[PDB]
Design a protein around this ligand. Structure first.
Ligand SMILES: [Zn+2]
Ligand SMILES: [Zn+2]
Ligand SMILES: [Zn+2]
Ligand SMILES: [Zn+2]
Lengths: 354, 354, 354, 354
């Protein structure tokens, strides 16, 4: 009745632990993973303690799997179903849900439970709260390596594009093309952007940017970002800027390149610094109408259902994000380490457990 | 001097007339057409008198052309510049512009001047009010047959999708696939729709729908729409429905297939009837939260610039709308009549003057 | 273990009956009523069968009360708590709630459960589903006759003003000034309306209208509404119109008085007709940008909490809506009858049980 | 036909100078001022060189006056008209106006022309560009000391409340109660806020705050702002926060007291510092969904007409902002200096010219 899981032992230390296999509440489900993917979040969780001290916590929160047990009141999911599990699995009966922000259901960022306040998906099984509200059915027609890009990568990048308030034909710059960065680009093509400028530090995975809708690549090795983008837009700037990675000073770049009345949409997790700087003069001394938004990705069944459809109806192919495919539980560790030691060919690895 | 122009002589009669070539005021410009396209709107105007009697009114309101004269205070356009002229050319200094509705600058629909309250583009020359605000430069790289779909077809169909409040992955139905309908399909793809259900009466121009993003074709000859669309969506309905053509009874269809909280976005010109019917029960007896919108397409310099970019950055290829291309002024009549009797191969015709 | 309740016996007949006292599930609460109100809704249900046949269904859905029993998992409400019970008490775990429409949680209007799919509040006890999500604590400082205006009247009227997209200083027309209409008048004042024109059939309850913020009274006995409003507004029309009562043709009137780009917000229950008429010409032949909205009122704890604060912080005093106050269970029968055959002094009656 | 005007001679020195009376262009008007008011902005321009060096620039930008000359094309305004002149008088024919941001018509803050790129209202005459778009008629029934609060104070404060996305019953904090702060309080009551917490530096002009709708006063002398507001709102924070004054660090306070999903609405001119700090942990490390907005107040004819109606229909009485009334041109110098330091509980002065 036991299970192995790849865990954070303490800040700096990871290892395999072994626990009682979890029991579902009346509304929850127990899922075994079919594919999983590690993210930079887990590294900052373990090695920089970006979310504080943790002890013997199974890592990972991007998984698609097979439901194996359901509580007595779970009505839409039965043992055997292939499901897509959003990284964010909020508690759906809170006053924040009545306000429309499920990401923060029960506290700030509290919709994010995996490898934060509960054991994550890097185990033989994991626990999904409120199955009927927090799982989506996975069509057979969608491959696992593509599906596992939906729980975080796709929903975050697309949320960047949602937050940017893009108008048809607007010119959009994307700052940082990690895997989320690339999805922000597809997210902008999905909101009808015209010109899409992808800005990356070397090494640039250019083909991926162009594939997902980029019209220009800006490489920081060719000069400051603000200068490159102003020159491309003949001084007008961009209608929106999506921040999908970088240091705190990238926020000032965003304000500096967005035209008045445009929007800076941040989806990046800033791990260091006490304040994120907003430049005074380039924010109009507070009046340039440059709206700044910054949000955690949506989770829950509906968001997953809606992005699955984007994948199924051939609107976006997230499989080009997957640069490494491993098989078998032992490789979960190997894949985890690839995210620390950042190589050159790497976007995102996927471990298929089958 | 004089000019040739194809006019509505009176309700029921069209023919070529002769006028003084119009002169520009200090802010206007005179354009001669390079390519023009006729629209059904002119048909409802001439043969159904949908806007009342007119006498010797040059018809047509879709053109790209060559500036030949400009007023003393026009700053961005010179004789010789190739320009895209939007169907809607409003007066930009009215209280309706400060309210955010330039389409109704000076009264309901008053932003639409060509072949409504001023002579249209089916002449050797025509008058564009407020040149710097109402003309867009045409890049050499964009062909004329494709560029002339921007003044009405592209801006209207897209406006249908803008009004529909489309969310990423939403399911969208498009009712009526004329040229405008087809652009509503492209617009829905541009707002990130997943499944897009295109509904037409036979003959369905299927290849065009599929090309611009349709995932399903509903043929009215196969049974009532509502029954077909419910069966496609396993009873759930659609998140939005864009009306781009049909009789008044199509407004009820839209309401019957949209789920509660969905949006019916109308861009169709209803030419006959006293009422457009809203079915009481399926509008929840006034409480289903099915919002209905109906709007004239945006025009002006910025709208055209933003859609030109959508063509330019390979977002939408509107050239597949153009099913008939003729050359020479004489053929304006031939093309105009093509819009009266609707044959089967016809989506949109274009007359090139060169 | 029985209880008396005032019920719809069958279509056409009401009477006091005796039922099993309800039991709460682990998430439910049992409330005894402290004050109740009858609604027109109950009339259309009983005598016109608006929601079909029913047998022994306790009527009524506006109550403030005292919790007497709670399920094992209720955390925020205990036996003894005075609470405001919203008319809409939805199931909070549905895909419609993730879409943002709890009113339609599980189907159209399904957030409306009382005297629809479950026994209403005209009993010695009634059952509130999901107490932690669907009850609000009632401060002692708020009188019961005012509090019982919050479950439907205040939230429906205010929803009318929320939907109208009222801008600061906008001119708002409210069509029909019953209790809901009067709260829409106050709703338009709370959203910053300047001029607020109240339109009523005789006898006009003017004093309440002016008291809730109306600046003009239009009496229909003095002539057609459309002609009256145009003369008041020097031909310009109104920025928004809230429909809070009338026949189906009041929709067509609303469209005729709203300026282009304005909004028609409906909160009225339309009981007869196959269609609600939208006039084609005055709706711009489908292009006047006159947006039409029609929605059921919000419910749940957060909606109630927020209106409770509006009364508590002296933003709105709903008591002037209450024209008849009785004491004792017996007078629920008398109050119900007042809703049919509506006399001249009557807005809304309240029965206090104490 | 010369005129004297109160000018910024250079950084640090002001004085009465002599200039040619300005002439109107064909669309412009010349106004003589009837009442005027100085603002802190002119101080930051004069003594801190906030907009760089200027020479012989007439100051001041809040005035209501009398039309004395009109251009050949002015159609809605004649010599003799009482007009309210908004601080922002933008050029209405730029692509930034088509995007919906007239404050930035022609560049960042470029809708603000008075005492920036043209002579301000502290002269015997001043020049209003594009009269038909930038003047509103002033009813006799509105007193001058009240009317002159509309060009800047009322429109700025209300814009703070417009930007905050306030929901009916929401809890709103206003940080800083200068004159703008007080209008922001009135703005939050006009968007239907329930609880309104006004936060000020000592000494608090309390009576004004309560008059415009404040329900709680927070004094910084009783402890840090963050600590107090958490205590008042039992840990939940406020749904929105309007910044109407303070140093750069007040932005961090704002982020710290607003709940996840709330909005920080800034209308303050931040004059010093290189960065405005957004605190990382309280901004969700980039994901708390705390939207930050910052905007220049709206201008133009319609904005003024709409605030005039709010005053006219007794929705807001701004005269309580007017604490000092002086008479005569000579007193323009005296009134200007009151704005350079903390004088009294009174603050904002008005000069009546009659
Ligand atoms: Zn992640
Ligand atoms: Zn047409
Ligand atoms: Zn009710
Ligand atoms: Zn000022």
């Amino acid at each position: 009745h036991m299970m192995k899981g790849f865990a954070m032992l303490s800040i700096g230390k990871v290892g395999w632990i072994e626990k009682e296999k979890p029991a579902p509440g009346p509304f929850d489900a127990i899922v075994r993973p079919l594919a999983v993917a590690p993210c930079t979040s887990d590294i900052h969780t373990v090695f920089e303690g970006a979310i504080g001290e943790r002890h013997n916590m199974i890592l990972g929160h991007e998984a698609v799997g097979e439901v194996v047990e359901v509580g007595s009141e779970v009505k839409d999911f039965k043992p055997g179903d292939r499901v897509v599990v959003p990284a964010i699995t909020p508690d759906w009966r809170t006053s924040e849900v009545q306000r429309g922000y499920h990401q923060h259901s029960g506290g700030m960022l509290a919709g994010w439970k995996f490898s934060n306040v509960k054991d994550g998906v890097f185990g033989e099984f994991f626990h999904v709260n409120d199955a009927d509200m927090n799982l989506a059915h996975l069509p057979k027609e969608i491959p696992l390596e593509a599906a596992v890009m939906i729980p975080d990568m796709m929903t975050t990048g697309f949320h960047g594009a949602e937050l940017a308030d893009i108008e048809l034909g607007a010119t959009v710059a994307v700052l940082g093309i990690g895997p989320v960065g690339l999805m922000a680009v597809a997210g902008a093509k999905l909101r009808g952007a015209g010109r899409i400028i992808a800005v990356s530090k070397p090494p640039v995975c250019v083909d991926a940017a162009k594939y997902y809708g980029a019209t220009d690549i800006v490489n920081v090795k060719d000069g400051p970002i603000e200068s490159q983008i102003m020159n491309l837009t003949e001084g007008k700037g961009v209608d929106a800027a999506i921040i999908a990675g970088g240091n705190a000073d990238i926020m000032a770049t965003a304000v500096k390149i967005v035209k008045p009345g445009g929007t800076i949409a941040n989806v990046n997790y800033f791990g260091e610094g006490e304040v994120l700087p907003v430049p005074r003069l380039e924010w109009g001394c507070g009046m340039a109408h440059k709206t700044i938004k910054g949000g955690l990705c949506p989770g829950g069944r509906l968001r997953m259902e809606r992005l699955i459809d984007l994948v199924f109806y051939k609107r976006v192919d997230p499989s080009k994000l997957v640069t490494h495919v491993f098989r078998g539980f032992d490789n979960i560790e190997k894949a985890f380490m690839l995210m620390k030691d950042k190589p050159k060919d790497l976007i995102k690895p996927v471990v298929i457990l089958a």
